[PDB]
Structures are given as C-alpha cells and as structure tokens.
Enzyme design. Structure first.
Site, PDB file in Angstrom:
ATOM      1  N   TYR B 100       0.929  -1.140   0.043  1.00  0.00           N
ATOM      2  CA  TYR B 100      -0.001   0.032  -0.162  1.00  0.00           C
ATOM      3  C   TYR B 100       0.879   1.451   0.034  1.00  0.00           C
ATOM      4  O   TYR B 100       0.678   2.267  -0.695  1.00  0.00           O
ATOM      5  CB  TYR B 100      -0.958   0.043   1.318  1.00  0.00           C
ATOM      6  CG  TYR B 100      -1.715  -1.118   1.196  1.00  0.00           C
ATOM      7  CD1 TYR B 100      -2.706  -1.728   0.213  1.00  0.00           C
ATOM      8  CD2 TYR B 100      -1.620  -1.769   2.336  1.00  0.00           C
ATOM      9  CE1 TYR B 100      -3.417  -2.630   0.418  1.00  0.00           C
ATOM     10  CE2 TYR B 100      -2.352  -2.986   2.257  1.00  0.00           C
ATOM     11  CZ  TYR B 100      -3.521  -3.427   1.477  1.00  0.00           C
ATOM     12  OH  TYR B 100      -4.075  -4.612   1.740  1.00  0.00           O
ATOM     13  N   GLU B 195      -5.325 -13.738   0.130  1.00  0.00           N
ATOM     14  CA  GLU B 195      -6.170 -13.740   1.185  1.00  0.00           C
ATOM     15  C   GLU B 195      -7.370 -14.722   1.009  1.00  0.00           C
ATOM     16  O   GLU B 195      -7.693 -15.416   1.837  1.00  0.00           O
ATOM     17  CB  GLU B 195      -6.897 -12.254   1.564  1.00  0.00           C
ATOM     18  CG  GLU B 195      -5.652 -11.247   2.140  1.00  0.00           C
ATOM     19  CD  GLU B 195      -5.287 -12.064   3.155  1.00  0.00           C
ATOM     20  OE1 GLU B 195      -5.943 -13.023   4.024  1.00  0.00           O
ATOM     21  OE2 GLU B 195      -4.057 -11.869   3.630  1.00  0.00           O
TER      22      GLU B 195
HETATM   23 MN    MN Z   1      -4.168 -12.810   5.170  1.00  0.00          MN
HETATM   24 MN    MN Z   2      -3.321  -9.577   3.932  1.00  0.00          MN
END
Ligand code: MN
Ligand code: MN
Ligand code: MN
Ligand code: MN
Lengths: 287, 287
Positions: B100, B195
């Site tokens: 980020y 994720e």
């Molecule tokens: Mn994760």
């Molecule tokens: Mn993550």
C-alpha cells in the site's frame, strides 16, 4: 491505532534490512540435490551419520526459531517497520527447516529419516539447549513484558542465530569445501546468508533496548548474558564431542563454535569472550 | 523436543497449502505503479480521497494481521507443518501492508501521505473494528490457551481476511474494472489471491478445533460467532456510509460486504447468513 507507513522512517535500518531479506528470498525447489548421491555413497557410515545428525539438530533449531522465537519477539515490538522484517525472517526459518527435509529425501530412505527424527526428538542435549533458549521466548507469553525480558529474549535469539547453529553448520561446509555434497552445501550456504543478516538485525534491536534500560538493569542483563553464554557453551562442548569424536573433528569444530560465539557477542555490541584461533580453511572454502 | 519433518505427513493438507503460498510469492517491486498517474490525475477530488482512505484502512488491517494475528495463532498450534504455513502467511501480511505504501509513494506527496496516516491512526471506526478483532488475538498472550479461545481467534482471523477487508478492496477493483488505476489494481489482486487461500486455510484449522470441542462449547462458540458477525456488520455499514456516500456507491459496496461475509462463514464450514444478490459487474471485472 497505527498502521505501518514506509514513507516515514521509523529507524535508520529496517528498510535496508527488509530489502536485503526479500532480495535473498529462495526456496528448496531451486536446488536439485540428487547429484550429491554419488559422493554420499563414497562417505563412510560415520561421516554419513554425523551429517544426518547435524542436519537433524539444525532442523529442530529452525523449527523453534520460526514457531516461537521470531513470533514472540516481534509481537512485543512497537516499531512496525522492524516487526515487518522479523515476520519475514520468521517465514524464512520455516523455509530453512523444510530445506533440510529436501536434503534428507535424496540422501536417506524413509526408514533412515524416521531414525534421525526419533534421535532428534529424544536427544537430551538438543532438548536442553532448545529448552534454555525457548524459556526466554516463553516469558513473552503475557500481555505486557518488561524491557529486560524482551532484551534477554533477543540475546537468546542472537545466541541461537549466530552461535548455536554453527556446531551443525560446520560439517556441511567442511564436506562442501572438499567437493563433497556440494548441492546440499549450496542450500546450507543460502541458510547461512539469511542467518548472518538475521543475527545482525536482532542484535541492533537488542542494542536499542539496552540503551533504554537503567544502569542497574544494564548490569543485571550483562550478568545474565554471560551466564547464558557459558551454560550454552557447556552444552555445545558435550554436543560436539558426541557428534564428531567418531570422525576426529571435535577440536576443529570447537574453534568454530567459539569464533561464532564471539560473532554473536559482537552482534549484540558486546566484547568477544574467547581468544581468537585459526579456523579450518576448508570450512572457510565451503562458505 | 520435536522438529518439523516434511517426509511424514502431519495432516493431509498443509503441504499443498505450503506449496501454493510459496508459488504465489510476490513483492511490490515487481509492479511499477507510475503508469497509474494518468488515470489518478483524472479522478475527482472525492474519488481520490475515497481511494486513499480505503488503502489506509487496509494498511491498518494488514498491519494487525502480520503483527498479532498470524503470530499469536501460530505459536499455539501443535501441528508443525501447519505452523509453517501460517508463518509464511504472516510474512506475506507484511508484504501486503508495505505494498500500500508503494502505491502511495507514486500517487501522493509526502505531505498527502502524512495526512492519510494521521487520519487512519485517529479514526474511531477503524479503531473499534481493529480492536474487536485484536481482542481475540490478545487473549492468546498466555502460556496455556483453551481450544475455545484458539477457535474464536481463528474465527476472528477469517472474519478479518475473508469479510472485513472487502469494504476496502471494493473500490480499487471498481476502478480497475473501468481501466483506471490498473497497476494498483494488479497489486490489490495479488493481495486478494493470497487472502483467498489464507481464509480457506485458517478456516480448515478452525473446523479441526471445533471438532475437539464439547457439545456445550460448540454451542457457545456458535453463539459468539453469530454475535461477532453482526457487531462487525454494523461497524461495516457505518464505514461504507462514511467512505462511499460522496461517490454514490454505498449500496453496491454493501452487497459486496454481505457476499464476502458469506464466504468467511463458508470457510468456517458455517451456513451463509445473507441472501445471494447480484454484485456490481464492474468490480467482478476488476477481479
Ligand atoms: Mn491474510
Ligand atoms: Mn493480508
Ligand atoms: Mn534459520
Ligand atoms: Mn534465523
């Protein structure tokens, strides 16, 4: 609640360590070990057993560093950039641990591998040295820790990283420096490249904490660190005699242990404890 | 003391998750974000501010997952092969959080980036929602934890990475599905790819622990989980109103929040709670 911001330095060094750790990223599938079979089979059974035993011990130490050492130290850090580097280091310990299995699958039968993990799991010296290190980590299993507790966990981590691995690293380097088991030797050299930088980094963090201690706590931690050093040394001296007496290398490896113990100390910004001695050039050539 | 032995299966899934996590390895330096400047500069002020706000929040959540969530859950696991996967995942949360910043350094000025982190650090909703999740992790800061405590930490972890991130992921995907900020959208897609498997994995482990609970503790945890789901949903409804009202996308994002909450529930082997609705095809195209 704070998010990590890499556009504002939290310290002078975490970014460069981050970049170096990730530059050095590797996994075991990048090294084929099967061409070591040829030299493996020309080793005596004593040499083979020593090699397997040392790899087993290294596996255990890395399992503890990945599973307890990096996670419990990092959770208590306030410096979010530094935390990040320790999380990455933590993953690489697991990459290291898995690497030894990659070497075992090529050099040993399924039954011979059971033998070695049974020998690790029941070994009293390995249990003692792992137990000692990890007792400092397990002190951190509570909501708030003192600076002294965190500092001593970091000393233990450096002593593991920079000192305790080397009675094991010696033998793969020795063989590789003679052109034997050179593929396995490559993997060991990747692990050492990581651990060199792990030890430096954790030692910088420890030095920071030490500066936040009172003059008194500074004395107490120096006394504890010297005691820890010597309790581990006595274990290591017994371990080297057990492993290397069959192959005539106990005094060689003992020199390399002390050399690396002095490197650990120096990583902590402490003075060396052992007199300097000539380390085997063959292991320096395997490096 | 046991060392990790990858030549003897400890379960019948950790190895394939280990291989997939490492196959997916990536670093931010592999995506140049500078070609996004073009579309960045044609976004309105409201759009730019919503993008920076969501990336800020996501940075906070990954910070907590790398710094507390994976470490504290993994330290209590007995399965050494599963531990290893979670330590790798933990390092990739730090790669996510740092990614980020990489987007920020190309899109925003040093002062603009200070503005964002000041806003995340003092945000009361982001504090509450982080705090709720992290309270389950902080219960693990003790030598012995109960199966129930570990299970609820794993529910919280899956709720974070299968459910809570998506009110944030929505916007980068919505822009990328219109050909805007596509380089940043690549990085977001790499995070989501991780994720997606983090969630499945933690949920498999949660299901294992649930099976070792008594019928009565099974009932208690079912109740806590539903209550947690709904407390977080209320916080998500407030966050999505705050962020997306200015750009007309509140109802769109709310649908995507529900969709992904149902995914989290499914990862835990639980029934979905919300009706299937049509999700914005433009975010599906961004994915
Ligand atoms: Mn994760
Ligand atoms: Mn993550
Ligand atoms: Mn290691
Ligand atoms: Mn290490």
């Amino acid at each position: 609640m704070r998010a990590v911001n890499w556009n504002k330095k939290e310290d002078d060094f975490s970014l460069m360590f981050w970049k170096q750790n990730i530059a050095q990223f590797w996994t075991e599938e990048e090294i084929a070990v099967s061409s070591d079979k040829n030299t493996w089979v020309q080793l005596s059974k004593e040499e083979q057993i020593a090699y397997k035993r040392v790899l087993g011990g290294l596996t255990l130490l890395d399992t503890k560093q990945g599973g307890e050492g990096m996670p419990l130290v990092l959770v208590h850090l306030e410096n979010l950039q530094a935390k990040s580097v320790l999380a990455f280091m933590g993953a690489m310990e697991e990459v290291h641990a898995k690497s030894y299995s990659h070497i075992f699958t090529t050099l040993a039968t399924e039954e011979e591998i059971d033998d070695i993990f049974d020998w690790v799991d029941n070994h009293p010296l390995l249990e003692k040295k792992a137990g000692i290190i990890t007792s400092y980590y397990r002190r951190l299993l509570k909501p708030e820790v003192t600076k002294k507790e965190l500092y001593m966990a970091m000393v233990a981590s450096v002593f593991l990283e920079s000192y305790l691995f080397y009675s094991g690293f010696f033998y793969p380097l020795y063989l590789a420096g003679q052109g034997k088991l050179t593929a396995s030797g490559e993997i060991i050299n990747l692990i050492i490249r990581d651990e060199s930088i792990h030890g430096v980094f954790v030692g910088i963090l420890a030095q920071q904490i030490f500066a936040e201690l009172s003059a008194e706590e500074q004395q107490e931690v120096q006394k504890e660190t010297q005691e820890l050093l010597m309790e581990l040394y006595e274990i290591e001296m017994a371990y080297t005699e057990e492993i290397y007496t069959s192959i005539g290398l106990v005094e060689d490896v003992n020199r390399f242990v002390r050399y690396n113990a002095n490197k650990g100390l120096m990583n902590l910004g402490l003075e060396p404890k052992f007199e300097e001695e000539e380390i085997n050039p063959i292991v320096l050539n395997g490096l």
